[PDB]
Design a protein around this ligand. Structure first.
Ligand code: BGN
Ligand code: CA
Lengths: 272, 123
């Protein structure tokens, strides 16, 4: 009935994170009885000013999603967020297009609730310290700051890929994310150039609180390294104006509401 | 093998300053070129780039797939996929001396500023 406190009293700190044990969503569903159809939860104890839509770009990685949901749901509920989970499944055989799917997530999530904050998360990154709140701040927030893939270190100061959070204002301010990055690499850097070109600076939790594990996996033959990324990240200033929220077109082939998550398969086209 | 910035840094000391490129710039370039993965192999447009430096078989090394390029480096492409970096470095220098740093497209966009972060204080 009263606003949720600044810091949740439910936090534990560092958690053991492993992908050795198999997951059973039915168990997960059982363990998280408060999650409602669609992967929604709203703290009933206090009122969270954080209305967060979590968006996961996706394609043929159902196993990762299992772990993601297994760890993430208990954490997000403990951080006292009013959230919703959205998996943006890419239909087709064209190279993976992360940023674009993140754009779809933004639009689709909005159709469901008055969300004011968006966290964009790869399906294979899991936070190791619930103090790394999955929400928005006064500036764009980078969350996968100390990934084990990088020795629990920030690989480079301009790094914004992995998992991040932008408020609606912030996301809207840069015309969202680009749509023309097909294949691996650069789009997260392009997004970084945007936040920069709009006078915003990236905020991050320290290297300890931001530790994260990543489920390693065999290279994706459908997400080959994009040959054009090197030239494209050099023109954001010009292109963020023509390629972004304002140029987003896609076709929703199916909307699936599972008890733990909303899955939206879309046809985002082909490398035009 | 995925090397660390410092491991890479210490291995290439002899390329430092060559053709004008410092160690800090190379550490940056390499991170954005192969992610320090000595075994990186990226194939596109009918040619294949190998290792830490992503040296292509189109002109530089001999591959069984594209058996007769100029093999300017005088080395088998599979040689750029182990943990012995001397030949890789020897090859890269030929590239720097012949084509220049622009061979490495990661250079201009990610390594024009904020170089200090690329330094390795480890002796
Ligand atoms: C050269 C710029 C294009 C590119 O490859 N950018 C990639 C990012 O997309 C990726 O998130 C990080 C971490 O792997 O590494 C960068 O090098
Ligand atoms: Ca070698």
């Amino acid at each position: 009935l009263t606003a949720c406190p600044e810091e949740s009293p439910l936090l534990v700190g560092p958690m053991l994170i492993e992908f050795n044990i198999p997951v059973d969503l039915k168990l997960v569903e059982q363990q998280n009885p408060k999650v409602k159809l669609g992967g929604r939860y709203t703290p009933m104890d206090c009122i969270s000013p954080h209305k967060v839509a979590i968006i996961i770009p996706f394609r043929n990685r159902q196993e990762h999603l299992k772990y993601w949901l297994y760890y993430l749901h208990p954490i997000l509920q403990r951080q006292q967020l009013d959230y919703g989970i959205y998996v943006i499944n890419q239909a087709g055989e064209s190279m993976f297009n992360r940023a674009k799917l993140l754009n779809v997530g933004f639009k689709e999530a909005l159709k469901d609730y008055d969300y004011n904050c968006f966290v964009f998360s790869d399906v294979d990154l899991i936070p190791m310290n619930d103090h790394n709140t999955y929400r928005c701040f006064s500036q764009p927030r980078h969350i996968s700051v100390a990934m084990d893939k990088f020795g629990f270190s920030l690989p480079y100061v301009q790094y914004f890929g992995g998992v991040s959070a932008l408020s609606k204002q912030q996301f809207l301010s840069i015309n969202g994310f680009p749509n023309n990055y097909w294949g691996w690499g650069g789009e997260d850097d392009d997004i970084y150039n945007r936040l920069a070109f709009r006078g915003m600076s990236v905020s991050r939790p320290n290297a300890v609180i931001g530790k994260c594990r990543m489920i390693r996996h065999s290279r994706d033959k459908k997400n080959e390294p994009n040959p054009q990324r090197f030239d494209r990240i050099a023109h954001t200033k010009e292109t963020m104006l023509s390629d972004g929220l304002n140029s987003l077109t896609y076709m929703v082939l199916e909307v699936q509401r599972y008890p733990l998550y909303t899955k939206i398969t879309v046809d985002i086209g082909t490398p035009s | 093998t995925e090397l660390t910035k410092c491991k890479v840094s210490h291995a290439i000391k002899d390329i430092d300053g060559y053709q004008g490129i410092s160690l800090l710039e190379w550490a940056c370039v390499l991170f954005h070129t192969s992610g320090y993965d000595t075994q990186a192999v990226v194939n596109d447009n009918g040619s294949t780039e190998y290792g830490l430096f992503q040296i292509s078989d189109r002109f530089w090394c001999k591959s069984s797939e594209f058996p007769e390029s100029e093999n300017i480096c005088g080395i088998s492409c599979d040689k750029l996929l182990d943990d012995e970096l001397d030949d890789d470095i020897a090859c890269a220098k030929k590239i720097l001396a012949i084509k220049g740093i622009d061979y490495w497209k990661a250079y201009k966009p990610m390594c024009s500023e904020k170089l200090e972060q690329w330094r390795c204080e480890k002796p």
